[PDB]
Each structure stands twice: as structure tokens, then as C-alpha cells.
Amino acid sequence: SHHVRVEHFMNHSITTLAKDTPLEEVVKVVTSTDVTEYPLVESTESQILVGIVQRAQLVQALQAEPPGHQQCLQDILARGCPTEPVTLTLFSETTLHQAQNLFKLLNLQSLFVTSRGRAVGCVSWVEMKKAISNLTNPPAPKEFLEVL
Amino acid sequence: SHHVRVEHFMNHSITTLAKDTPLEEVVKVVTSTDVTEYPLVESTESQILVGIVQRAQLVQALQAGHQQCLQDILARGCPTEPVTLTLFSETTLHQAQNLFKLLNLQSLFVTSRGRAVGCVSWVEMKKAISNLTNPPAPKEFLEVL
Ligand SMILES: [Cl-]
Ligand SMILES: [Cl-]
Ligand SMILES: [Cl-]
């Protein structure tokens, strides 16, 4: 468990929202995902994690002030949409041993993962359990299908 | 302890080393400090935490064209350690305490928006806990007239 790192088993299927993300794109993201929260990044270019926004809060803000006159996420945040601070995260190089101990002892359900400050994934017990299982029962290699 | 945050009691007296920090400056930092490790940041301008470098390894590399910078010594073999856990400016004292106690930690660096901004050890933690019930009196300061 000391050789397996979070980057090996983390879920890459996360959708980051940036302060400069066009409001049209924000609406598309919110109406196409069902996650409870989204990692907020400084800019689309940097992807530097700076906070967390809860979907329920973002939905409420969008319903109140529906999206020429181009707008971005920062406009909605400046308008009053609540954001949450980042107080704990995993890192790409955090070991499976460290991650499991952290989740167990702090009674956590999930955490975002950063690498060089950038939001790169998330880990929940679903991913953790899969990694632990692979320790003794590694899955068979993935197979491909193609039009020969 | 839910209202006191790490940024309130962390030690701001940290010296980061950046990938583009000239070796001349690296020598100045090492010779003027007494810590066993330094937070490594992407660039002097960004201060984005990307790793940790141990004093002993820096010394070894130093004891062994373009202006030579830290990144050059790292490329030549100086080992770097990964960041696997940190505190954040907004982490609460309650959270910090639990983290240190349950994981048996002695210290961690603190980041804010990805930037290295301080460090916390039991020295700072104990002072914060003490201040909860016995806060120090406000200090008096003079203006430079
Ligand atoms: Cl488990
Ligand atoms: Cl794995
Ligand atoms: Cl304090």
C-alpha cells in the first residue's frame, strides 16, 4: 500500500469550474452532472484549486439570475453565490496507505486531489476499495475492440 | 476551535526555494536558516508548492552558460520529496489538531490557493490552544515619526 499512489486509482472524471468559465458553459455543466459539489479553480488556463462550490447553491444562484453581455462564473460569485474553503485534499503522490488511514481516522467520504496546485481528480471509498482489492486480486488487462 | 483557523497561528517565517531561484540565492538561504527541509515552489513569481527539498541533499549537491538555478541542481541529481499532505489557510484549529493527533504528525506546510504560505508544528499548535482560554493582551507599538 506504500507503492500505490492516489494518482493510480483516483477518479479523473471531475469537472472543474473556473472563475472565468463562461456562464453558458456553467449552465451546461450543472445540468449535465449530478455531483454535490465542484472544485473551483482560479482560471481555465491554470486549473489552480482555490475553493469549492456546492451544486445546490450554484443552481439557486442561476435560477435567480439566469444567464452582447457575456458573463462568467465570477460574476455569479460576486453577486452572492456561496463558496466553500478548501481545508483538506489528497495529492497525486499521497500513498494508498496514507489515503486509507486519512479517510478512516477522519471519517471522510471523499476528497479532491491536487498536483502542483491543480485539481486533477477525486477519491471516494468506491475508488479506495477498488485499489485495495487490486492489491491481492489485480484485474485482467483491458481489451480493445476495433474495426480491423 | 471551530472558529480559529490555521492562518491565525501558522508560522509565516518560512523560506521557499523556487525552481528558478539562482544558486547564489540558494546558498544564501541555506546558510541563513536552520531548517531540515524547504518547500519547493514552481517559480519565484507563483510560489505554487510543488515539492519539498531536504537541507542535507541541497548541501551535498552544492558541495559537488546560463545562470545556474535550483532546477539545474535538481536535474543533476538532487533528490526531491513529494508533498503528500498539507494544511490550508482556512483549515480550522479543530481540524488541524485532529489531523496532527490521529496521524501522529510533528509539522506540515500550509497552502493558500496553492501557494506555500507558512508552516505549523506543535509549537504553534500549542500556542493557539493556549490562546483559546488565555489570550495574550494586545501589544503596544510606536509610530516612526
Ligand atoms: Cl478499506
Ligand atoms: Cl490501482
Ligand atoms: Cl491564535
Summarize the structure.
By secondary structure, chain A is α/β, with parallel strands linked by helices.
Please tell me about this protein's structure.
- Two copies of one chain form a homodimer.
- The first copy, chain A, is globular, with a radius of gyration of 18 Å.
- The longest helix of chain A is centred in the C-terminal third of the chain and has 12 residues, at 125-136.
- In chain A, the strands form two sheets. In chain A, strands 1-2-3 form a three-stranded mixed beta sheet.
- Chain A has a single domain, classed as CBS-domain, CATH 3.10.580.10.
- In chain A, β4 (90-91), α5 (96-105) and β5 (110-115) form a beta-alpha-beta unit.
- Chain A is an alpha/beta fold.
- The first copy, chain A, has helices spanning 6-9, 23-30, 55-64, 73-79, 96-105, 125-136; strands spanning 17-18, 37-41, 49-54, 90-91, 110-115, 118-124.
- In chain A, α5 (96-105) crosses α6.
- The first copy, chain A, is 34% helix and 19% strand.
- Chain A binds chain B through residues 42, 48-50, 85-89, 91, 93-95, 98, 101-102, 105-106, 114, 116-118, and chain B through 42, 48-50, 82-86, 88-92, 95, 98-99, 102-103, 111, 113-115.
- One chloride ion is lined by residues 4, 8-9, 131, 134 of chain A.
- The site of one chloride ion has 3 residues of chain A, from α6.
